[PDB]
Amino acid sequence: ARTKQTARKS
Amino acid sequence: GAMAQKNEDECAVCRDGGELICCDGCPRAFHLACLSPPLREIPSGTWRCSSCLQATVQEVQPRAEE
Ligand SMILES: [Zn+2]
Ligand SMILES: [Zn+2]
Protein backbone atom coordinates (compact mmCIF):
# COMPACT_ATOMS: atom_id res chain seq x y z
CA ALA A 1 0.00 0.00 0.00
CA ARG A 2 1.12 3.59 -0.62
CA THR A 3 1.45 4.18 3.10
CA LYS A 4 2.49 7.58 4.45
CA GLN A 5 3.42 8.83 7.90
CA THR A 6 2.92 12.58 7.87
CA ALA A 7 2.15 14.98 10.70
CA ARG A 8 -1.34 14.78 12.20
CA LYS A 9 -3.39 17.92 11.74
CA SER A 10 -6.27 17.08 14.08
CA GLY B 1 7.07 7.28 -19.08
CA ALA B 2 7.71 6.92 -15.37
CA MET B 3 4.71 6.29 -13.15
CA ALA B 4 5.41 9.15 -10.78
CA GLN B 5 2.29 8.79 -8.66
CA LYS B 6 0.99 11.31 -6.16
CA ASN B 7 -0.33 10.69 -2.67
CA GLU B 8 -2.44 12.96 -0.53
CA ASP B 9 -0.87 14.05 2.74
CA GLU B 10 -4.41 14.39 4.03
CA CYS B 11 -6.91 11.57 4.51
CA ALA B 12 -9.86 11.53 2.08
CA VAL B 13 -12.08 10.95 5.11
CA CYS B 14 -11.29 13.83 7.49
CA ARG B 15 -8.45 15.56 5.57
CA ASP B 16 -6.16 14.84 8.53
CA GLY B 17 -2.56 13.64 8.31
CA GLY B 18 -0.44 11.02 10.01
CA GLU B 19 -0.99 7.31 9.46
CA LEU B 20 -2.11 7.40 5.84
CA ILE B 21 -2.68 4.58 3.39
CA CYS B 22 -2.87 5.72 -0.22
CA CYS B 23 -4.38 3.96 -3.21
CA ASP B 24 -2.30 2.81 -6.18
CA GLY B 25 -4.33 4.31 -9.02
CA CYS B 26 -5.91 7.04 -6.91
CA PRO B 27 -3.90 9.75 -5.07
CA ARG B 28 -6.26 9.61 -2.08
CA ALA B 29 -4.72 8.56 1.20
CA PHE B 30 -6.83 7.40 4.13
CA HIS B 31 -6.57 6.69 7.83
CA LEU B 32 -6.66 3.03 8.82
CA ALA B 33 -9.71 3.26 11.08
CA CYS B 34 -11.44 5.94 8.98
CA LEU B 35 -11.71 3.51 6.07
CA SER B 36 -14.69 1.24 5.53
CA PRO B 37 -13.84 -1.49 5.87
CA PRO B 38 -11.14 -0.13 8.23
CA LEU B 39 -7.59 -1.39 7.78
CA ARG B 40 -6.01 -2.66 11.00
CA GLU B 41 -2.78 -3.50 9.25
CA ILE B 42 -1.02 -2.33 6.10
CA PRO B 43 -1.70 -4.42 2.96
CA SER B 44 1.18 -5.58 0.78
CA GLY B 45 0.38 -4.91 -2.85
CA THR B 46 -1.51 -2.43 -4.97
CA TRP B 47 -4.14 -1.12 -2.60
CA ARG B 48 -7.36 0.38 -3.91
CA CYS B 49 -9.83 2.72 -2.23
CA SER B 50 -13.50 1.76 -1.86
CA SER B 51 -14.46 3.54 -5.09
CA CYS B 52 -11.85 1.53 -7.01
CA LEU B 53 -13.04 -1.79 -5.56
CA GLN B 54 -16.57 -0.80 -6.48
CA ALA B 55 -15.46 0.15 -9.98
CA THR B 56 -15.55 -3.45 -11.20
CA VAL B 57 -17.37 -2.28 -14.35
CA GLN B 58 -16.49 -5.51 -16.16
CA GLU B 59 -17.96 -8.98 -15.59
CA VAL B 60 -17.54 -9.73 -11.89
CA GLN B 61 -16.43 -13.30 -12.59
CA PRO B 62 -19.55 -15.29 -13.59
CA ARG B 63 -19.45 -18.37 -11.38
CA ALA B 64 -22.35 -20.11 -13.10
CA GLU B 65 -21.18 -23.72 -12.82
CA GLU B 66 -24.66 -25.06 -13.53
ZN1 LIG C 1 -9.47 9.95 8.21
ZN1 LIG D 1 -8.31 4.69 -5.70
Q: Any idea what the CATH number is for the domain that residue B30 is in? A: 3.30.40.10
**Count of alpha carbons within 13 Å of B59, Cβ hemisphere only?**
4
Distance B28 CA to ligand 2 centre (A): 6
Question: Which strand (E) or helix (H) includes residue B52?
Answer: helix B50-53
Question: What is the domain count for chain B?
Answer: 1
Coil vs helix vs strand at B50: helix
Method of determination used here: NMR
Which residues have a Cβ under 8 Å from the Cβ of B49 and sit 6 or more positions away?
A: B12, B23, B26, B28, B30
Ligand 2 centroid from CA B31, angstroms: 14
CA separation for the pair B25, B50 (Å, rounded): 12
Domain ranges, residue B52: 1-66
Backbone torsions φ then ψ of A7, nearest 5 degrees: -80, 135
